[PDB]
Amino acid sequence: LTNSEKSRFFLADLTGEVQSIPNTYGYISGLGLFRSAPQTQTTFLMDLTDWDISLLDAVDRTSRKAETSAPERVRQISFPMMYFKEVESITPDEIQGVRQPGTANELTTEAVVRAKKLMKIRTKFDITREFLFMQALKGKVIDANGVLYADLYKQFDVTKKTIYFDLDNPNSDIDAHIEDLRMHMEDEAKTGTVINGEEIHIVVDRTFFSKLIKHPKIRDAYLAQQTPLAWQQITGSLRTGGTDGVQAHMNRFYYGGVVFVQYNGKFKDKRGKTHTLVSIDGVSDTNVGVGHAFPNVAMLGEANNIFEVAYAPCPKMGYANTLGQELYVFEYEKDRDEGIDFEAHSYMLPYCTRPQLLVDVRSDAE
Amino acid sequence: PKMGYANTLGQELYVFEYEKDRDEGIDFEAHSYMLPYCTRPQLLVDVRSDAE
Amino acid sequence: AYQGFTKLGEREPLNDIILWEEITPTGHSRKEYAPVASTEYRVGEVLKADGSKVAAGQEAQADSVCIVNFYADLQLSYHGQLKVVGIYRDAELKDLLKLESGVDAAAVKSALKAKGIDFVPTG
Secondary structure: EEEOOOOOEEEEEEOOOOOOOOOOOHHHHHOOOOOOEEEEOOEEEEEEEEEEOOOOOOOOOOOOOEEEOOOEEEEEEEEEEEEEEEEEEEHHHHOOOOOOOOOOOOOHHEEEEHHHHHHHHHHHHHHHHHHHHHHHHOOOEEOOOOOOOEEEEHHHHOOOEEEOOOOOOOOHHHHHHHHHHHHHHHHHHOOOOOOOOOOOOEOOOOOHHHHOOOOHHHHHHHOOOHHHHHHHHHHOOOOOOOOOOOOOOEEEEEOOEEEEOOOOOEEEEOOEEEEEOOOOOOOOOOOOEEEEEEOOOOOOOOOOOOOEEEEOOOOOOOOOOOOOOOEEEEEOOHHHHEEEEEEEEEEEEEEEEHHHHOEEEEEOOO | OOOOOOOOOOOOEOOOOEOOHOOOOEEEEEEEOOOOOOOHHHHHOOOOOOOO | OOOOHHHHHHEOOOOOOOOOOOOOOOOOOOEOOOOOOOOOOOOOEEEEEOOEEOOOHHHHHHHHEEEOOEEOOEEEEOOOOOEEEEEEEEEEEOOOOOOOOOOHHHHHHHHHHHOOOOEEOEE
């Protein structure tokens, strides 16, 4: 029961309230790829040791001559970490007099405002974490502003690998490119163990997935099948799996021993420019599809995990030299009952210890 | 206009006591947000001691 | 860093290049030098008679091969020794050689081979 329009003396009804929460994506965060590695200091080091092998050259017996092998190579690297701080304040003049949306004549309290502010802060930090994880998956950790914090390829002295699927050409060998991507991980892992290249994640965008599932070779291959998989993929829901941040079921496609998942995650920064999670810095031709292939968790084993995220303490008066945390929230009151201050801190870095395994994928031809 | 007092019934006088940093002293503050009015101003008439 | 990568350095070469040497009570193939000026020695660098590294055009006067890691700032070796020791007599080292800029290896190897220092192939 609130004042009607046009007249302050007659009444109308206020049925309810509709809200438009922004879309948020958390696929990479929910994947569980980046194991948590709490940290005490502000920087962490790492030792890199490797050796090489060669073939013996035949040497004659009577002239007693031999061969030798080069010694090992040991290096060391260091990592800085990003600090995120976000401040929010509550004041009496945004509570006094202001009316609670969706209600006729009841007033906003401090509790609802505080709850909504904290929820927005936590959501912002979650989407920032997801964007950082995706950037680390790309192999280069670029901040939303654009500043470089850790270039994994130069740090480990490796070169990025990209594969051109050439989905436009009807005669393209999809099997050949899939096999190349599959064998690249096995060849460049160099962990000393036995690698299974079929255990990888291939995350592509909308255009790449559309061009892949509509290729004449793939469709003609799956149409001439009498298996339930082909029936589902051709005439059926292409949305198995999922539980994405927005959609309940992500698009995925089985062609070889690998799967292609379509990820639509995108965010905006303060400047207004959008940040598509599945993208290549530089490419924007609109008609080319891009993707990112990274090793599965169960490929190198749990003993050799390559996806870790660090956390170090905030610079507060009593948190020094302690284990890091996902997020710190602090309550500070303004003097003279003038309001309440909020601060949120998070000091993290996602990184990959084997950046060579992060393989890029494109839909155009080289 | 202070936290914990917004959207509350007003009083004749609001007396507050604030402690200065480092026990330097005590800060006071007196607030009063008031306005008197007469519902029937036609009953208020001025009388003067001089002719028109 | 502002450049994107921080490389704290590479481990200095280990004293493992020696495969065989004339083992004698006082040491036969090893001689000690006076560390010249502010000079940073490492394992496998070819030295002259005075103690400085061989430069381009000075290949014929190759006197020995350094087998210690010296530090100019500390004026001490990596084992806390006051002098720098090289290999100048009958011995057999590996191909690992920290040559200077613009100095050919073949002239250095032949000069060392004249004194009885042999180099083995390394894979």
